[PDB]
Structure 1
Amino acid sequence: RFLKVKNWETDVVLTDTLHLKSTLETGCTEHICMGSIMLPVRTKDQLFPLAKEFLDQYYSSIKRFGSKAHMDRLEEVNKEIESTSTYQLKDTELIYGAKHAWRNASRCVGRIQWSKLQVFDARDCTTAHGMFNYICNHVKYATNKGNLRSAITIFPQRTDGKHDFRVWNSQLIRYAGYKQPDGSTLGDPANVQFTEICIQQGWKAPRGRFDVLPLLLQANGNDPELFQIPPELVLEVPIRHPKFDWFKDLGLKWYGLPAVSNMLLEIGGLEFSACPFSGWYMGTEIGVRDYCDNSRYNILEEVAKKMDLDMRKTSSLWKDQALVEINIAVLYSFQSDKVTIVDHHSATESFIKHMENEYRCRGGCPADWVWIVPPMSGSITPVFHQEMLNYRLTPSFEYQPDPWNTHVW
């Protein structure tokens, strides 16, 4: 129960003690591994032990476990819970909580940067208009003229479940998707239902292939509100190839800022249902997933056509060939435009370093092999031959149902 993990490319062996501090469950049992499954209103008695575990962590990290300051805080929170049926995080705890939620995100390959996170406390927010303002400042700060900076903005915590703050967008910036008359799909197919929700709520769509969606912001449980992100804040990159001049005529571009906004940040038992966070892209997320997935932009066949590869048989590996050039082009475009981006070799190497460090300083590092290994060229990245243990630590980012299935108007 002091588990070893081995790297089969380097014979490096690491001992994991940190999994011992695991709270939540995995959905796996002794009889079935569910490690590839995408997606497997608290009470007063539920909250205090949750609050205690977190404060114990916190005061331990500032080298003050068991101190007067620690005890007094524990007492203070304990009083507040009995009385208010919840409690409030101190600024310093809020920052620790956010940074550590990222650190514990076993599906995230970029966690080597985990401690350099910019936390924007928006707990004083009361309206969607106010949310729009916090969100615009997030986007501007994080983008930073192409020199991306990681950030999270944290809106008021859940209270009774009827006063929830939600960003209805899955990411702050995404391209729209419209289903065409001939059955096809213009723009981004993944966003079709949401794109039609905006329209079905008053959005006037330009119906282009790359229309930046509007923000749908829900404050204190009210009906959500539409806002257009000032285009001057949406940093976009035209996609060209360093060797293929025709590449530009495909007319592709992507946004520079990956900013996920549909997850729930849980700290000390407290639930932050609106907490959009952002960093910078790994090249493959755009090139492999966004562009080439069949259920997305699916440009492979079109690109392969321009290269004049042999698309008659699958054993020509024309898909693979095209896949590579596309990802070469995405990296090349971003880099030329001085927008931050990381290639899948650099990032997986970074993560391997990060692993070493966490075993060396923390005694372990939760990691989800199925998500850490890039969607192309898997086995020539170091992570592929790295055994990983996946377990659930807290604070954490968790999934939550899409608002339109829950909300009442």
Structure 2
Amino acid sequence: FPRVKNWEVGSITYDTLSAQAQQDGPCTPRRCLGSLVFPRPEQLLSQARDFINQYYSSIKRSGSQAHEQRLQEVEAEVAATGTYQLRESELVFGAKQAWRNAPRCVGRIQWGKLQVFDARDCRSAQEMFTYICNHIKYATNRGNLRSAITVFPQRCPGRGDFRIWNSQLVRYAGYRQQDGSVRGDPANVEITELCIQHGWTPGNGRFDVLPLLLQAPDEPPELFLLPPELVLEVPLEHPTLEWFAALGLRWYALPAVSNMLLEIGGLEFPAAPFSGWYMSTEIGTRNLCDPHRYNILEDVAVCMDLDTRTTSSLWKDKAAVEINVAVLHSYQLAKVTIVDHHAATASFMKHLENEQKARGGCPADWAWIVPPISGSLTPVFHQEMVNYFLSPAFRYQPDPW
């Protein structure tokens, strides 16, 4: 039972929950690989049994009637058909647990407040798009954001697979050049190549919201132009730097990830887009200041008249902080839900204590919980963490080509 210390307070806990990890991680006694982003058939019944046992443990209903009975029909369902279908409430319980189990998510204090949209009966790129469009509008909610996941049908052998080709529902274009360099988002130049290579008319500028590439089983993808009224965006202004607005920066309201594979009780949902709301460093620090993203940091420091000739003026740090101030200020002025990294990390420490008494620990990936600016100014920095894989979970999956 791994001993875990908080160095700011001096408190000690034990992660007894780690003793129940499934999928082995990338680390061995000889070398740690925790900093790696992507680490490198009756098996279905073992994972199905275990997920059902989880479900009835939570609702105080282990070791009695419906517990016994629910065990049998999945046995028979797999005996007869080879796969199985989840009860709607089990799908709800599995989705919240996969969120609860995400080691890299700092927002998990919210894990119990999740809206599960069941799309398991879907069957075309036209049905997808409507299900996706109801999500975005419910999730956006005029800027009062609400966490939501939409679950498309559970993959089965012999036939294709529902998949969304974009990494997220809202992405910005990335256009090449005579010189390779990109107008717009460099992280999306590739999926921008597939949209133009499928009928889409390439726009001009930096913040062109890409269309969707939606794929029903076996049939090729189909473009879908998102409605401008459905894609809520926030223009970026600074409370006291009047020229910041003139830089023409924007970001969208809804982070909705659409390339991860939801896995519950041995079943795989390659299309299950989930969404919440942004922590501000995600936008201001990574999306806008990463050298391989919008890379705006030097442009903002010039406007602030900072001395960029020597790193020791800390001009990168000063301009970064102001970009984050502008993100927080702009989202709040537009009445769009956002959380700063101080509030978010303090809530995550509260989640750690909750999960300690409820489950005896919590899988947390230190390198992703600590924010990308001002790390040691937040409490999670001084908190040791244990990382491991619990089920149900969100997994990465290959790109569909």
TM range (shorter): over 0.9
Aligned-pair CA distance for 1:16: 1.3
Instruction: Give the match for residue 355 of structure 1.
Output: 352
Instruction: Give the match for residue 20 of structure 1.
Output: 19
Of residues 222-231 and 386-395 in structure 1, the stretch that sits farther from structure 2 once superposed is: 222-231
Q: Which amino acid aligns with 1:128?
A: A
What's the CA shift string for 1:248-294, capped at 9, x where partnerless? 11000000000000000000000000000000000000000000001
Query: Residues of 1 paired with 2:361 and 2:168: CA distance?
Result: 30
Query: Residues of 1 paired with 2:382 and 2:399: CA distance?
Result: 36
Instruction: Give the match for residue 87 of structure 1.
Output: 84
Q: Which amino acid aligns with 2:92?
A: I
Q: Which amino acid aligns with 1:66?
A: G
- Given the alignment of the two structures, is residue 382 of structure 1 paired with residue 379 of structure 2, yes or no? yes
Query: Residues of 2 paired with 1:354 and 1:380: CA distance?
Result: 18
- Given the alignment of the two structures, is residue 367 of structure 1 paired with residue 364 of structure 2, yes or no? yes
- Given the alignment of the two structures, is residue 213 of structure 1 paired with residue 191 of structure 2, yes or no? no
Instruction: Give the match for residue 283 of structure 2.
Output: 286
Instruction: Give the match for residue 44 of structure 2.
Output: 47
Counterpart of 1:329 (choices 326, 330, 339) is 326
Q: Which amino acid aligns with 2:59?
A: I
Instruction: Give the match for residue 10 of structure 2.
Output: 11
What's the CA shift string for 1:66-122, capped at 9, x where partnerless? 212111111110011011010000001000000000000010000000010000000
What's the CA shift string for 1:93-152, capped at 9, x where partnerless? 000000000000010000000010000000010000100000000000000000000000
- Given the alignment of the two structures, is residue 31 of structure 1 paired with residue 30 of structure 2, yes or no? yes
Query: Residues of 1 paired with 2:369 and 2:204: CA distance?
Result: 35
Aligned-pair CA distance for 1:161: 6.6
Aligned-pair CA distance for 1:221: 3.1
Instruction: Give the match for residue 169 of structure 1.
Output: 166
What's the CA shift string for 1:211-231, capped at 9, x where partnerless? 001111111232111101111
Query: Residues of 2 paired with 1:366 and 1:36: CA distance?
Result: 15
TM-score (norm 1): 0.97
- 1:192 aligns to what SS in structure 2? helix
Query: Residues of 1 paired with 2:8 and 2:69: CA distance?
Result: 50
Instruction: Give the match for residue 73 of structure 1.
Output: 70
Query: Residues of 2 paired with 1:89 and 1:74: CA distance?
Result: 12
CA gap of 1:161–1:203, structure 2 versus 1, over 3 A, is farther
- 1:345 aligns to what SS in structure 2? helix
Aligned residues: percent identity? 68
Counterpart of 1:248 (choices 209, 229, 245) is 245
- 1:353 aligns to what SS in structure 2? helix
Aligned-pair CA distance for 1:12: 2.0
After TM superposition, list the pairs within 5 Å mapping 1:299-310 onto structure 2. Answer: 299-310=296-307
Aligned-pair CA distance for 1:362: 1.4
Query: Residues of 1 paired with 2:375 and 2:158: CA distance?
Result: 42
- 2:308 aligns to what SS in structure 1? coil
- 1:52 aligns to what SS in structure 2? helix
- 1:403 aligns to what SS in structure 2? coil
After TM superposition, list the pairs within 5 Å mapping 1:140-219 onto structure 2. Answer: 140-160=137-157, 162-219=159-216
TM-score (norm 2): 0.99
Counterpart of 2:57 (choices 55, 60, 71) is 60
- Given the alignment of the two structures, is residue 344 of structure 1 paired with residue 346 of structure 2, yes or no? no
Long gaps (5+) in structure 1? 405-409
Of residues 207-216 and 284-293 in structure 1, the stretch that sits farther from structure 2 once superposed is: 207-216
After TM superposition, list the pairs within 5 Å mapping 1:311-326 onto structure 2. Answer: 311-326=308-323
Query: Residues of 1 paired with 2:53 and 2:2: CA distance?
Result: 24
Q: Which amino acid aligns with 1:233?
A: L
- 2:338 aligns to what SS in structure 1? coil
Long gaps (5+) in structure 2? none
Q: Which amino acid aligns with 2:264?
A: I
CA gap of 1:288–1:70, structure 2 versus 1, over 3 A, is same
Q: Which amino acid aligns with 2:178?
A: P
- 1:350 aligns to what SS in structure 2? helix
Aligned-pair CA distance for 1:14: 1.8
Runs of 4+ in 1 over 3 A off after TM superposition: none
- 2:329 aligns to what SS in structure 1? helix
- 1:226 aligns to what SS in structure 2? strand
Instruction: Give the match for residue 274 of structure 1.
Output: 271
Query: Residues of 1 paired with 2:19 and 2:64: CA distance?
Result: 24
- Given the alignment of the two structures, is residue 265 of structure 1 paired with residue 284 of structure 2, yes or no? no
Of residues 114-123 and 182-191 in structure 1, the stretch that sits farther from structure 2 once superposed is: 182-191
Query: Residues of 2 paired with 1:355 and 1:161: CA distance?
Result: 43
Q: Which amino acid aligns with 2:260?
A: M
- 1:237 aligns to what SS in structure 2? strand
Query: Residues of 2 paired with 1:182 and 1:300: CA distance?
Result: 21
Instruction: Give the match for residue 407 of structure 1.
Output: none
Aligned-pair CA distance for 1:391: 0.6
